[PDB]
mmCIF file of C-alpha atoms and ligand atoms in Angstrom:
data_model
loop_
_atom_site.group_PDB
_atom_site.id
_atom_site.type_symbol
_atom_site.label_atom_id
_atom_site.label_comp_id
_atom_site.label_asym_id
_atom_site.label_seq_id
_atom_site.Cartn_x
_atom_site.Cartn_y
_atom_site.Cartn_z
ATOM 1 C CA UNK A 1 -32.971 11.042 13.342
ATOM 2 C CA UNK A 2 -31.343 13.356 10.763
ATOM 3 C CA UNK A 3 -30.757 13.794 7.030
ATOM 4 C CA UNK A 4 -27.706 11.729 6.046
ATOM 5 C CA UNK A 5 -26.688 14.497 3.653
ATOM 6 C CA UNK A 6 -28.136 18.012 3.841
ATOM 7 C CA UNK A 7 -27.414 21.610 2.813
ATOM 8 C CA UNK A 8 -28.737 24.707 4.621
ATOM 9 C CA UNK A 9 -28.687 27.858 2.588
ATOM 10 C CA UNK A 10 -29.264 31.651 2.993
ATOM 11 C CA UNK A 11 -31.887 33.506 1.016
ATOM 12 C CA UNK A 12 -29.662 34.707 -1.879
ATOM 13 C CA UNK A 13 -28.562 31.122 -2.706
ATOM 14 C CA UNK A 14 -32.226 30.069 -2.841
ATOM 15 C CA UNK A 15 -32.430 30.857 -6.581
ATOM 16 C CA UNK A 16 -29.665 28.471 -7.702
ATOM 17 C CA UNK A 17 -31.273 25.869 -5.416
ATOM 18 C CA UNK A 18 -34.915 26.619 -6.248
ATOM 19 C CA UNK A 19 -36.293 24.547 -9.148
ATOM 20 C CA UNK A 20 -38.847 27.231 -10.038
ATOM 21 C CA UNK A 21 -35.970 29.686 -10.608
ATOM 22 C CA UNK A 22 -32.775 28.892 -12.433
ATOM 23 C CA UNK A 23 -31.892 25.832 -10.379
ATOM 24 C CA UNK A 24 -28.324 25.821 -11.606
ATOM 25 C CA UNK A 25 -26.824 24.182 -8.513
ATOM 26 C CA UNK A 26 -29.572 21.483 -8.742
ATOM 27 C CA UNK A 27 -28.111 20.168 -12.013
ATOM 28 C CA UNK A 28 -24.547 20.421 -10.756
ATOM 29 C CA UNK A 29 -25.424 18.229 -7.742
ATOM 30 C CA UNK A 30 -27.230 15.762 -9.990
ATOM 31 C CA UNK A 31 -24.103 15.531 -12.174
ATOM 32 C CA UNK A 32 -21.857 15.196 -9.067
ATOM 33 C CA UNK A 33 -23.887 12.284 -7.791
ATOM 34 C CA UNK A 34 -23.940 10.388 -11.064
ATOM 35 C CA UNK A 35 -20.225 10.903 -11.794
ATOM 36 C CA UNK A 36 -19.621 9.719 -8.218
ATOM 37 C CA UNK A 37 -21.754 6.616 -8.668
ATOM 38 C CA UNK A 38 -19.957 5.513 -11.785
ATOM 39 C CA UNK A 39 -16.488 6.413 -10.440
ATOM 40 C CA UNK A 40 -16.573 5.307 -6.788
ATOM 41 C CA UNK A 41 -19.237 2.580 -7.340
ATOM 42 C CA UNK A 42 -22.163 3.786 -5.151
ATOM 43 C CA UNK A 43 -24.643 6.550 -5.602
ATOM 44 C CA UNK A 44 -24.321 9.095 -2.761
ATOM 45 C CA UNK A 45 -27.578 9.921 -0.895
ATOM 46 C CA UNK A 46 -29.823 12.752 -2.082
ATOM 47 C CA UNK A 47 -28.861 16.145 -0.717
ATOM 48 C CA UNK A 48 -31.822 17.565 1.188
ATOM 49 C CA UNK A 49 -31.573 21.314 0.790
ATOM 50 C CA UNK A 50 -33.530 23.751 3.006
ATOM 51 C CA UNK A 51 -33.452 27.413 3.806
ATOM 52 C CA UNK A 52 -32.139 28.746 7.101
ATOM 53 C CA UNK A 53 -32.695 32.481 7.730
ATOM 54 C CA UNK A 54 -30.215 32.358 10.605
ATOM 55 C CA UNK A 55 -27.548 32.132 7.909
ATOM 56 C CA UNK A 56 -26.057 35.178 6.313
ATOM 57 C CA UNK A 57 -27.505 35.907 2.841
ATOM 58 C CA UNK A 58 -24.481 34.335 0.988
ATOM 59 C CA UNK A 59 -23.525 31.536 3.405
ATOM 60 C CA UNK A 60 -24.266 27.753 3.182
ATOM 61 C CA UNK A 61 -23.574 24.872 5.471
ATOM 62 C CA UNK A 62 -23.099 21.255 4.158
ATOM 63 C CA UNK A 63 -24.292 18.798 6.848
ATOM 64 C CA UNK A 64 -24.007 15.049 7.333
ATOM 65 C CA UNK A 65 -26.366 13.294 9.747
ATOM 66 C CA UNK A 66 -27.025 16.723 11.351
ATOM 67 C CA UNK A 67 -23.342 17.471 11.868
ATOM 68 C CA UNK A 68 -21.841 20.393 9.971
ATOM 69 C CA UNK A 69 -18.948 19.200 7.752
ATOM 70 C CA UNK A 70 -18.681 22.275 5.551
ATOM 71 C CA UNK A 71 -19.532 25.974 5.099
ATOM 72 C CA UNK A 72 -18.563 28.859 2.835
ATOM 73 C CA UNK A 73 -19.586 31.898 0.843
ATOM 74 C CA UNK A 74 -21.035 32.245 -2.637
ATOM 75 C CA UNK A 75 -22.107 35.483 -4.252
ATOM 76 C CA UNK A 76 -24.504 34.962 -7.215
ATOM 77 C CA UNK A 77 -23.444 37.930 -9.297
ATOM 78 C CA UNK A 78 -19.721 37.605 -8.712
ATOM 79 C CA UNK A 79 -16.916 35.200 -9.508
ATOM 80 C CA UNK A 80 -14.188 33.420 -7.481
ATOM 81 C CA UNK A 81 -10.704 34.001 -8.866
ATOM 82 C CA UNK A 82 -8.446 31.105 -7.747
ATOM 83 C CA UNK A 83 -4.674 31.113 -7.619
ATOM 84 C CA UNK A 84 -3.775 27.605 -8.898
ATOM 85 C CA UNK A 85 -0.279 28.257 -7.684
ATOM 86 C CA UNK A 86 1.005 30.092 -10.723
ATOM 87 C CA UNK A 87 -1.219 33.247 -10.831
ATOM 88 C CA UNK A 88 0.405 36.645 -10.583
ATOM 89 C CA UNK A 89 -0.480 39.899 -8.825
ATOM 90 C CA UNK A 90 -3.763 40.363 -7.032
ATOM 91 C CA UNK A 91 -7.293 41.779 -7.719
ATOM 92 C CA UNK A 92 -9.662 44.085 -5.771
ATOM 93 C CA UNK A 93 -12.315 42.141 -3.888
ATOM 94 C CA UNK A 94 -12.935 39.955 -0.849
ATOM 95 C CA UNK A 95 -9.743 37.875 -0.384
ATOM 96 C CA UNK A 96 -11.022 34.589 0.996
ATOM 97 C CA UNK A 97 -9.791 31.024 0.747
ATOM 98 C CA UNK A 98 -10.883 28.278 -1.711
ATOM 99 C CA UNK A 99 -13.500 26.009 -0.075
ATOM 100 C CA UNK A 100 -12.099 22.726 -1.431
ATOM 101 C CA UNK A 101 -8.300 22.963 -1.729
ATOM 102 C CA UNK A 102 -7.663 26.045 0.449
ATOM 103 C CA UNK A 103 -5.967 28.017 -2.334
ATOM 104 C CA UNK A 104 -5.918 31.784 -2.206
ATOM 105 C CA UNK A 105 -8.941 33.358 -3.789
ATOM 106 C CA UNK A 106 -10.576 36.711 -4.557
ATOM 107 C CA UNK A 107 -14.313 37.370 -5.160
ATOM 108 C CA UNK A 108 -14.098 39.672 -8.199
ATOM 109 C CA UNK A 109 -16.841 41.487 -10.076
ATOM 110 C CA UNK A 110 -17.928 40.104 -13.482
ATOM 111 C CA UNK A 111 -16.093 42.826 -15.418
ATOM 112 C CA UNK A 112 -12.732 41.872 -13.852
ATOM 113 C CA UNK A 113 -13.117 38.284 -15.204
ATOM 114 C CA UNK A 114 -10.734 38.545 -18.101
ATOM 115 C CA UNK A 115 -8.238 40.460 -15.946
ATOM 116 C CA UNK A 116 -8.028 37.467 -13.628
ATOM 117 C CA UNK A 117 -7.600 34.968 -16.422
ATOM 118 C CA UNK A 118 -4.639 37.052 -17.808
ATOM 119 C CA UNK A 119 -3.082 37.154 -14.376
ATOM 120 C CA UNK A 120 -3.304 33.382 -14.358
ATOM 121 C CA UNK A 121 -6.330 32.907 -12.128
ATOM 122 C CA UNK A 122 -9.046 30.335 -12.625
ATOM 123 C CA UNK A 123 -12.462 31.984 -12.587
ATOM 124 C CA UNK A 124 -15.730 30.181 -11.733
ATOM 125 C CA UNK A 125 -19.242 31.254 -10.906
ATOM 126 C CA UNK A 126 -20.971 30.967 -7.464
ATOM 127 C CA UNK A 127 -22.775 27.679 -8.223
ATOM 128 C CA UNK A 128 -19.529 26.119 -9.359
ATOM 129 C CA UNK A 129 -18.008 27.006 -6.013
ATOM 130 C CA UNK A 130 -20.745 25.330 -3.902
ATOM 131 C CA UNK A 131 -20.700 22.344 -6.248
ATOM 132 C CA UNK A 132 -16.932 21.970 -5.986
ATOM 133 C CA UNK A 133 -17.051 22.130 -2.130
ATOM 134 C CA UNK A 134 -19.850 19.571 -1.943
ATOM 135 C CA UNK A 135 -18.106 17.290 -4.441
ATOM 136 C CA UNK A 136 -14.856 17.408 -2.438
ATOM 137 C CA UNK A 137 -16.750 16.697 0.800
ATOM 138 C CA UNK A 138 -18.649 13.759 -0.662
ATOM 139 C CA UNK A 139 -15.334 12.147 -1.660
ATOM 140 C CA UNK A 140 -13.704 12.751 1.710
ATOM 141 C CA UNK A 141 -16.681 11.250 3.618
ATOM 142 C CA UNK A 142 -17.618 8.596 1.020
ATOM 143 C CA UNK A 143 -17.164 5.840 3.595
ATOM 144 C CA UNK A 144 -19.202 7.621 6.226
ATOM 145 C CA UNK A 145 -21.968 8.342 3.649
ATOM 146 C CA UNK A 146 -22.060 4.706 2.707
ATOM 147 C CA UNK A 147 -24.515 3.635 5.336
ATOM 148 C CA UNK A 148 -26.305 0.392 5.976
ATOM 149 C CA UNK A 149 -29.247 1.328 3.826
ATOM 150 C CA UNK A 150 -26.944 2.395 0.960
ATOM 151 C CA UNK A 151 -25.513 -1.090 1.071
ATOM 152 C CA UNK A 152 -28.960 -2.592 0.825
ATOM 153 C CA UNK A 153 -29.793 -0.370 -2.179
ATOM 154 C CA UNK A 154 -26.421 -1.420 -3.726
ATOM 155 C CA UNK A 155 -27.160 -5.105 -3.065
ATOM 156 C CA UNK A 156 -30.689 -4.912 -4.637
ATOM 157 C CA UNK A 157 -29.439 -3.005 -7.678
ATOM 158 C CA UNK A 158 -26.673 -5.519 -8.155
ATOM 159 C CA UNK A 159 -28.741 -8.664 -7.559
ATOM 160 C CA UNK A 160 -30.263 -8.152 -11.029
ATOM 161 C CA UNK A 161 -26.878 -8.503 -12.720
ATOM 162 C CA UNK A 162 -25.564 -11.449 -10.585
ATOM 163 C CA UNK A 163 -28.584 -13.157 -9.065
ATOM 164 C CA UNK A 164 -26.890 -16.498 -8.368
ATOM 165 C CA UNK A 165 -24.172 -14.508 -6.525
ATOM 166 C CA UNK A 166 -26.302 -12.303 -4.280
ATOM 167 C CA UNK A 167 -29.087 -14.583 -2.943
ATOM 168 C CA UNK A 168 -26.685 -17.484 -2.252
ATOM 169 C CA UNK A 169 -24.316 -15.184 -0.305
ATOM 170 C CA UNK A 170 -26.409 -12.657 1.618
ATOM 171 C CA UNK A 171 -27.443 -13.161 4.302
ATOM 172 C CA UNK A 172 -26.779 -16.894 4.541
ATOM 173 C CA UNK A 173 -22.968 -16.704 4.403
ATOM 174 C CA UNK A 174 -22.183 -12.915 4.639
ATOM 175 C CA UNK A 175 -24.564 -10.780 6.589
ATOM 176 C CA UNK A 176 -25.432 -7.221 5.434
ATOM 177 C CA UNK A 177 -23.455 -6.157 8.474
ATOM 178 C CA UNK A 178 -20.241 -7.834 7.311
ATOM 179 C CA UNK A 179 -20.644 -6.912 3.702
ATOM 180 C CA UNK A 180 -21.281 -3.235 4.667
ATOM 181 C CA UNK A 181 -18.195 -3.089 6.883
ATOM 182 C CA UNK A 182 -15.994 -4.547 4.125
ATOM 183 C CA UNK A 183 -17.258 -2.143 1.400
ATOM 184 C CA UNK A 184 -16.847 0.708 3.907
ATOM 185 C CA UNK A 185 -13.208 -0.350 4.495
ATOM 186 C CA UNK A 186 -12.514 -0.168 0.779
ATOM 187 C CA UNK A 187 -14.142 3.265 0.495
ATOM 188 C CA UNK A 188 -12.244 4.683 3.540
ATOM 189 C CA UNK A 189 -8.982 3.891 1.701
ATOM 190 C CA UNK A 190 -10.333 5.230 -1.622
ATOM 191 C CA UNK A 191 -10.741 1.820 -3.231
ATOM 192 C CA UNK A 192 -13.704 1.832 -5.701
ATOM 193 C CA UNK A 193 -16.424 -0.743 -5.327
ATOM 194 C CA UNK A 194 -17.636 -0.703 -8.959
ATOM 195 C CA UNK A 195 -16.652 -4.337 -9.487
ATOM 196 C CA UNK A 196 -19.119 -5.954 -7.172
ATOM 197 C CA UNK A 197 -18.876 -9.291 -8.971
ATOM 198 C CA UNK A 198 -15.185 -9.556 -8.020
ATOM 199 C CA UNK A 199 -15.952 -8.396 -4.492
ATOM 200 C CA UNK A 200 -18.865 -10.868 -4.034
ATOM 201 C CA UNK A 201 -16.998 -13.748 -5.722
ATOM 202 C CA UNK A 202 -14.060 -13.205 -3.381
ATOM 203 C CA UNK A 203 -16.236 -13.042 -0.254
ATOM 204 C CA UNK A 204 -18.001 -16.141 -1.466
ATOM 205 C CA UNK A 205 -14.773 -18.102 -1.421
ATOM 206 C CA UNK A 206 -13.191 -16.947 1.829
ATOM 207 C CA UNK A 207 -16.088 -16.017 4.114
ATOM 208 C CA UNK A 208 -16.924 -19.695 4.912
ATOM 209 C CA UNK A 209 -13.559 -20.042 6.702
ATOM 210 C CA UNK A 210 -13.028 -16.371 7.535
ATOM 211 C CA UNK A 211 -15.705 -14.144 9.083
ATOM 212 C CA UNK A 212 -13.595 -11.210 10.236
ATOM 213 C CA UNK A 213 -14.304 -8.169 8.036
ATOM 214 C CA UNK A 214 -10.710 -6.931 8.212
ATOM 215 C CA UNK A 215 -9.250 -10.271 6.991
ATOM 216 C CA UNK A 216 -11.854 -10.285 4.201
ATOM 217 C CA UNK A 217 -10.872 -6.721 3.339
ATOM 218 C CA UNK A 218 -7.298 -7.858 2.678
ATOM 219 C CA UNK A 219 -8.302 -10.599 0.288
ATOM 220 C CA UNK A 220 -10.840 -8.415 -1.511
ATOM 221 C CA UNK A 221 -8.259 -5.676 -2.026
ATOM 222 C CA UNK A 222 -5.885 -8.206 -3.645
ATOM 223 C CA UNK A 223 -8.768 -9.326 -5.941
ATOM 224 C CA UNK A 224 -9.225 -5.664 -6.865
ATOM 225 C CA UNK A 225 -5.516 -5.348 -7.474
ATOM 226 C CA UNK A 226 -5.743 -4.325 -11.146
ATOM 227 C CA UNK A 227 -8.386 -1.696 -10.381
ATOM 228 C CA UNK A 228 -6.305 -0.376 -7.527
ATOM 229 C CA UNK A 229 -3.058 -0.316 -9.503
ATOM 230 C CA UNK A 230 -4.789 1.405 -12.438
ATOM 231 C CA UNK A 231 -6.463 4.133 -10.315
ATOM 232 C CA UNK A 232 -3.207 5.616 -9.000
ATOM 233 C CA UNK A 233 -1.037 4.672 -12.031
ATOM 234 C CA UNK A 234 -3.299 4.931 -15.094
ATOM 235 C CA UNK A 235 -1.888 3.554 -18.314
ATOM 236 C CA UNK A 236 1.645 2.082 -18.781
ATOM 237 C CA UNK A 237 3.703 4.810 -17.203
ATOM 238 C CA UNK A 238 6.241 4.290 -14.448
ATOM 239 C CA UNK A 239 4.988 3.409 -10.921
ATOM 240 C CA UNK A 240 6.595 5.966 -8.580
ATOM 241 C CA UNK A 241 5.996 4.984 -4.948
ATOM 242 C CA UNK A 242 7.211 5.467 -1.464
ATOM 243 C CA UNK A 243 9.011 2.440 -0.053
ATOM 244 C CA UNK A 244 10.652 2.036 3.315
ATOM 245 C CA UNK A 245 14.172 0.840 4.160
ATOM 246 C CA UNK A 246 14.902 -2.848 3.584
ATOM 247 C CA UNK A 247 16.182 -3.290 7.125
ATOM 248 C CA UNK A 248 13.186 -1.360 8.514
ATOM 249 C CA UNK A 249 10.848 -3.739 6.674
ATOM 250 C CA UNK A 250 12.454 -6.839 8.166
ATOM 251 C CA UNK A 251 12.695 -5.086 11.564
ATOM 252 C CA UNK A 252 9.001 -4.184 11.353
ATOM 253 C CA UNK A 253 8.270 -7.773 10.300
ATOM 254 C CA UNK A 254 10.213 -9.161 13.278
ATOM 255 C CA UNK A 255 8.196 -7.094 15.754
ATOM 256 C CA UNK A 256 4.923 -8.501 14.479
ATOM 257 C CA UNK A 257 5.949 -12.097 14.958
ATOM 258 C CA UNK A 258 8.749 -13.078 17.374
ATOM 259 C CA UNK A 259 11.406 -10.600 18.239
ATOM 260 C CA UNK A 260 11.320 -6.835 17.886
ATOM 261 C CA UNK A 261 10.394 -4.265 18.308
ATOM 262 C CA UNK A 262 11.410 -0.672 17.663
ATOM 263 C CA UNK A 263 11.929 2.204 20.084
ATOM 264 C CA UNK A 264 8.940 4.492 20.426
ATOM 265 C CA UNK A 265 11.146 7.371 19.265
ATOM 266 C CA UNK A 266 11.723 5.574 15.977
ATOM 267 C CA UNK A 267 7.961 5.089 15.770
ATOM 268 C CA UNK A 268 7.799 8.880 15.749
ATOM 269 C CA UNK A 269 10.726 9.005 13.270
ATOM 270 C CA UNK A 270 8.585 6.706 11.146
ATOM 271 C CA UNK A 271 5.758 9.239 11.308
ATOM 272 C CA UNK A 272 7.968 12.315 10.588
ATOM 273 C CA UNK A 273 9.791 10.641 7.702
ATOM 274 C CA UNK A 274 6.516 9.541 6.182
ATOM 275 C CA UNK A 275 5.484 13.183 6.199
ATOM 276 C CA UNK A 276 8.796 14.031 4.513
ATOM 277 C CA UNK A 277 8.326 11.291 1.920
ATOM 278 C CA UNK A 278 4.765 12.451 1.368
ATOM 279 C CA UNK A 279 5.824 16.059 0.733
ATOM 280 C CA UNK A 280 8.530 14.788 -1.586
ATOM 281 C CA UNK A 281 6.082 12.855 -3.720
ATOM 282 C CA UNK A 282 3.881 15.890 -4.576
ATOM 283 C CA UNK A 283 7.177 17.693 -5.331
ATOM 284 C CA UNK A 284 8.091 15.011 -7.891
ATOM 285 C CA UNK A 285 4.532 15.022 -9.314
ATOM 286 C CA UNK A 286 4.189 11.439 -8.077
ATOM 287 C CA UNK A 287 1.174 9.978 -6.258
ATOM 288 C CA UNK A 288 1.030 9.715 -2.392
ATOM 289 C CA UNK A 289 1.482 6.002 -2.494
ATOM 290 C CA UNK A 290 3.462 4.033 0.075
ATOM 291 C CA UNK A 291 4.061 0.488 -1.101
ATOM 292 C CA UNK A 292 4.980 -2.114 1.524
ATOM 293 C CA UNK A 293 5.056 -5.855 2.142
ATOM 294 C CA UNK A 294 1.651 -7.484 2.463
ATOM 295 C CA UNK A 295 2.179 -8.378 6.127
ATOM 296 C CA UNK A 296 2.776 -4.719 6.851
ATOM 297 C CA UNK A 297 -0.057 -2.981 4.868
ATOM 298 C CA UNK A 298 -2.937 -3.150 7.426
ATOM 299 C CA UNK A 299 -0.598 -2.137 10.244
ATOM 300 C CA UNK A 300 1.038 0.793 8.526
ATOM 301 C CA UNK A 301 -2.285 2.020 7.096
ATOM 302 C CA UNK A 302 -3.894 2.366 10.501
ATOM 303 C CA UNK A 303 -0.734 3.658 12.166
ATOM 304 C CA UNK A 304 0.159 6.345 9.626
ATOM 305 C CA UNK A 305 -3.126 7.506 8.145
ATOM 306 C CA UNK A 306 -4.393 8.365 11.666
ATOM 307 C CA UNK A 307 -2.416 11.582 11.358
ATOM 308 C CA UNK A 308 -1.674 11.475 7.638
ATOM 309 C CA UNK A 309 -5.026 10.510 6.056
ATOM 310 C CA UNK A 310 -3.845 11.646 2.584
ATOM 311 C CA UNK A 311 -1.428 8.715 2.533
ATOM 312 C CA UNK A 312 -2.250 5.622 0.440
ATOM 313 C CA UNK A 313 -0.717 2.341 1.754
ATOM 314 C CA UNK A 314 -0.795 -0.248 -1.054
ATOM 315 C CA UNK A 315 0.466 -3.839 -0.837
ATOM 316 C CA UNK A 316 2.976 -5.697 -3.012
ATOM 317 C CA UNK A 317 0.369 -8.413 -3.566
ATOM 318 C CA UNK A 318 -2.060 -5.697 -4.825
ATOM 319 C CA UNK A 319 0.322 -3.997 -7.241
ATOM 320 C CA UNK A 320 0.238 -5.510 -10.763
ATOM 321 C CA UNK A 321 3.456 -7.568 -11.264
ATOM 322 C CA UNK A 322 3.571 -6.406 -14.907
ATOM 323 C CA UNK A 323 4.512 -2.776 -14.181
ATOM 324 C CA UNK A 324 7.859 -1.107 -13.645
ATOM 325 C CA UNK A 325 8.320 0.222 -10.129
ATOM 326 C CA UNK A 326 10.848 2.818 -8.954
ATOM 327 C CA UNK A 327 11.052 3.816 -5.319
ATOM 328 C CA UNK A 328 11.196 7.639 -5.393
ATOM 329 C CA UNK A 329 11.031 8.237 -1.599
ATOM 330 C CA UNK A 330 12.331 6.264 1.321
ATOM 331 C CA UNK A 331 11.623 5.786 5.022
ATOM 332 C CA UNK A 332 14.747 5.064 7.062
ATOM 333 C CA UNK A 333 16.022 5.127 10.653
HETATM 334 CA CA1 CA B 401 -12.011 -11.841 -13.156
HETATM 335 CA CA1 CA B 402 2.132 -8.134 -6.805
#
């Protein structure tokens, strides 16, 4: 057995972690976990911190179930100057790399702080660096961190709000195993699970006749359509998405039923042009959203996100029919 979420730390990062001392990282973690619970819909597990004298004074390792998923530096008396893309010149110091987004970074002394801000850098203290890293890792592994016990804790906490919904569904109609796999499927594709009533209502309707967690994932995502549409396109602005070629769509649809399919070279064209469309979206300031026909969403999501996990494959039945959609990137032959 192992801690589902841990952090080993060298002796200079003990202060920010020690409650008796300043404990500044303690409060940043507590705020990360509560912002995460009200955004993504489940409270991430407590981070068990311990000291490891095998670690260099200023190094830390963020672990999950005993497996290292992160590591980096943090110097208590110094600051991390980050190039957000626009910064100019450089600064004396250790020229490392941002732990979360990989941006270029310099560890400057405290007296060079205003120098960095004038040169366009973003300056943060050491605890802010560890907290940013851990926050980015919790989001990336939110599905893996949502374990079976976390589903039970979520079910208990929710049974107070919707008692008729939870006892008459789990485990008589939907087992904790099936409900956990479904919620995990949503989290793996960055769909929030705040709206447990909609989720549980939906599973209550379909799970009698449909026990496969993947088929139930599709009908729950549709039920969460407004939450999905609003997360990537907040407000009333224009919905800028990747779509694929009309012919390609029908040709992809033929291959799934009778007819088809496409040459394996075109399957690799499909992958390369998705990478081209992806890079075009961030150039346009658009979101990395590929919008396809419902019968193609589960297929393209598994097929593309295997190598392009940053991609978000939404479905036409999930996108709110009241918003204006412009295809701003294509996927052809
Ligand atoms: Ca409703
Ligand atoms: Ca729709």
